[PDB]
Amino acid sequence: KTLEVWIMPNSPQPAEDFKALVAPFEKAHGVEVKVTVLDWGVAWTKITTAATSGVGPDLTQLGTTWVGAISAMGVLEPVDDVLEALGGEKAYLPAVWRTTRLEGARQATAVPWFSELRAFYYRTDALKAAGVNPAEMFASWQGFEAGLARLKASSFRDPETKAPLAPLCTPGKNSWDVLHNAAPWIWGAGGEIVRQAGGRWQSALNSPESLEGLYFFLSLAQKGYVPAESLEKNTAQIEADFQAGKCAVFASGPWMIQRAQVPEAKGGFAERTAAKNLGVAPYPAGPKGRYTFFGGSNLALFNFSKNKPLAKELLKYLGGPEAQVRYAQMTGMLPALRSAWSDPSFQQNPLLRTFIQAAQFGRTYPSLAGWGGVENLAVQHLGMAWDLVAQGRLTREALKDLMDKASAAINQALRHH
Amino acid sequence: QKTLEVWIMPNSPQPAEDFKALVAPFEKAHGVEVKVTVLDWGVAWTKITTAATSGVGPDLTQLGTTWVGAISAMGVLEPVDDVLEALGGEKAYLPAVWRTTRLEGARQATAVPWFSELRAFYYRTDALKAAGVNPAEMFASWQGFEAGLARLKASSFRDPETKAPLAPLCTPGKNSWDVLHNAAPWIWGAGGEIVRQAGGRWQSALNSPESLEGLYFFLSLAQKGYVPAESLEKNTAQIEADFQAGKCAVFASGPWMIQRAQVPEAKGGFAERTAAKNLGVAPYPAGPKGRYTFFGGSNLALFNFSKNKPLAKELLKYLGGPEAQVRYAQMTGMLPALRSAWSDPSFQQNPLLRTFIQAAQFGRTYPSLAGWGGVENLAVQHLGMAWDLVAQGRLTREALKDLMDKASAAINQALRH
Ligand SMILES: OC[C@@H]1O[C@H](O)[C@H](O)[C@H](O)[C@@H]1O[C@@H]1O[C@H](CO)[C@@H](O[C@@H]2O[C@H](CO)[C@@H](O)[C@H](O)[C@H]2O)[C@H](O)[C@H]1O
Ligand SMILES: OC[C@H]1O[C@@H](O[C@H]2[C@H](O)[C@@H](O)[C@H](O[C@H]3[C@H](O)[C@@H](O)[C@@H](O)O[C@@H]3CO)O[C@@H]2CO)[C@H](O)[C@@H](O)[C@@H]1O
Ligand SMILES: [Cl-]
Ligand SMILES: [Cl-]
Ligand SMILES: [Cl-]
Ligand code: NA
Ligand code: NA
Structure with a gap:
């Protein structure tokens, strides 16, 4: 039993780093997570083509500024249940919470993965x-x-x-x-x-x-x-x-x-x-x-996925405290989950503290x-x-x-x- | 213990994974680990010239044919006439490919032909x-x-x-x-x-x-x-x-x-x-x-500051030789640089590729x-x-x-x- 994930180049060895990140999930569930790396310059073409064609991965990385646009196409599975399992609206910065949905929408269509500014x-x-x-x-x-x-x-x-x-x-x-x-x-x-x-x-x-x-x-x-x-x-x-x-x-x-x-x-x-x-x-x-500029990337589940329960377990894993800290260490991004920002790993890094304390001035585009x-x-x-x-x-x-x-x-x- | 570092550009759908599969037989015969780093074409000039000026980088790098003269003229490449002789000398290559082995007017070859494309x-x-x-x-x-x-x-x-x-x-x-x-x-x-x-x-x-x-x-x-x-x-x-x-x-x-x-x-x-x-x-x-x-491709060059020149030249002889030539051309969809490797049915039996093989008659390169x-x-x-x-x-x-x-x-x- 198998999942396909599309990611962008978030770390120096993107596929290798991602496979190391999910190895514990693969051993716990007896499942292979396959990963395909899409450069940022082609990611919009490939993700929109998946959305219009009904053919694509189970999960895709989605830049925060694209969440509304793909959500508007009606192709994303609601993920309110995963966000609740990770502690709900209070487990996130309001800025991060706004990127979980098209502005004005009832249901979350994206799980916060990492933040950057x-x-x-x-x-x-x-x-x-x-x-x-x-x-x-x-x-x-x-x-x-x-x-x-x-x-x-x-x-x-x-x-x-x-x-x-x-x-x-x-x-x-x-x-x-x-x-x-x-x-x-x-x-x-x-x-x-x-x-x-x-x-x-x-x-x-x-x-x-x-x-x-x-x-x-x-x-x-x-x-x-x-x-x-x-x-x-x-x-x-x-x-x-x-x-x-x-x-x-x-x-x-x-x-x-x-x-x-x-x-x-x-x-x-x-x-x-x-x-x-x-x-x-x-x-x-x-x-x-x-x-x-404040952004980052979320993870979205295509509603044409044939593996939605398993894909949601992957979202809960990737969006959860352990995987949040590990991927932020491998990539140098900030955890999307508020609580992980306190982890000592991040606290003691002088250049990173400058990023964390500049978040005060972070602004992003309407969704x-x-x-x-x-x-x-x-x-x-x-x-x-x-x-x-x-x-x-x-x-x-x-x-x-x-x-x-x-x-x-x-x-x-x-x-x- | 013995190690080689190779820089390549994205020649195949999963570049690092495909290259590791290409070199697996060499690694097992010699007991050497080949580490590969993938450089996008847009940054490859900056990275290769910085390795050249700093005297720090890999053992081998992929070089676009049109760059062989330019890096050679910086005084940083090992002569590889011995490798080219072992692969059959000038007669083993199309004349256009043989010109890409050196800076125009140089006595010594400084690159081994890897693949061709037009x-x-x-x-x-x-x-x-x-x-x-x-x-x-x-x-x-x-x-x-x-x-x-x-x-x-x-x-x-x-x-x-x-x-x-x-x-x-x-x-x-x-x-x-x-x-x-x-x-x-x-x-x-x-x-x-x-x-x-x-x-x-x-x-x-x-x-x-x-x-x-x-x-x-x-x-x-x-x-x-x-x-x-x-x-x-x-x-x-x-x-x-x-x-x-x-x-x-x-x-x-x-x-x-x-x-x-x-x-x-x-x-x-x-x-x-x-x-x-x-x-x-x-x-x-x-x-x-x-x-x-346009007729081009890529060659492989050995930095003259490599600590592993004998072993790197054995890898060049391997990558340049009949078996590896067909294998990498099958994985990438390029043409072998070695003329003899063109006879494989993967090339001769490919009808869209026949159009490229016939277009090679009108193929033209830049001076080196x-x-x-x-x-x-x-x-x-x-x-x-x-x-x-x-x-x-x-x-x-x-x-x-x-x-x-x-x-x-x-x-x-x-x-x-
Ligand atoms: O982003 C990489 C591109 O993605 C495709 O799917 C393939 O991976 C392919 O490699 C493609 O990029 C183009 O590839 C060709 C052949 O390697 C490059 O052409 C070389 O350019 C060099 C630098 O100008 C020349 O020295 C050499 O002779 C050419 O073969 C081209 O630059 C890539 O954009
Ligand atoms: O607008 C789309 C999306 O952009 C996201 O930012 C991306 C940039 O587009 C991207 O260019 C940059 O790329 C670097 C990569 O993450 C690193 O590994 C680096 O070493 O290589 C790339 C530069 O060559 O990454 C950022 C962050 O992922 C925004 O975060 C997002 O909100 C927005 O929707
Ligand atoms: Cl704005
Ligand atoms: Cl790869
Ligand atoms: Cl010309
Ligand atoms: Na990788
Ligand atoms: Na596409």
């Missing part, structure tokens, strides 16, 4: 040589720009590369992170990705404060703090650039702390200079508030039926904003026109695919 | 039949190719699973090395080239009249609405996933997709999908100056130059910006020329470095 990694060696105080650089937008300017002027060279470091690396194309990396600047300026306007969600990417935030962020590339090359790269490539010692600063989740402690052979970067000179700081406060389509279009149009910088064509007016077109396309996507 | 068009047999397109006409010539795309665009055919129309052609517009490899046959078919020898040096020819004429024809297919806007922000993996999901009638790929079509989703294929039961292959059409396709990794990164970056001109409605002959002038200045720095 964004902050700035920085080269402790690079900022000290530039004379940049991290606490000041990451406190405000003025501090953040002032720090990048000192990093740009610095004569510091990576000991291994013997070359200067880009002050800031950020992916300009492909990745969902093109949206998640823009969102804190939009939010900090008092903007948002979407707003409710008389019963209906619509794009707010072209609101005055959304344009102010987005323009500040884009203007960092325009000022030469982000290298032109970075504007054509995706998250994986920017990550690799940081590990290789080529960027002083970059935004990521808590998984990089875990990657920093594991050799290249096992998918980490423990051998690199960047791993030995690693700091973390939260997103700076904008003029209207202080925000970072809407349109949302996978919104992320695809957002990533495409923000990709074109980064192009305006690459081309030396970034003005207030060209960004406004571009986000008007993004907003028209997003409004379509909130209505239908 | 590009052709997959097409939906059902979509072309419904549109009234004769594949022999569509894939004969540039005019026939555009005429076929026009019928596909007009067709009222809908995918049985998606219930939606198919884009006539999908092609990746960003990130992937394939952005270059996909443009090369149009450049070559117009009588252009990526580089040329002038003043006793290699330089960009991407801004020659014929190179611009082939690139312009290619980009004009998106301008004419035969390629969806969405595709122009996607990488290879996402375009492949779109084809498997039933969203594209035509796309350019290698022979590995034949293998993926025969394996369920759970094992990394698409056997469940309509496209898998409606799969045709046709060669690149002849351009005005003749018929060309110092600096080629830089050329590909810069080509992909600038060709990414050419696809952006289409997305922005700014594609003109003079805008393409100005952009390829910028590409050519950047490329010439990389070839001189």
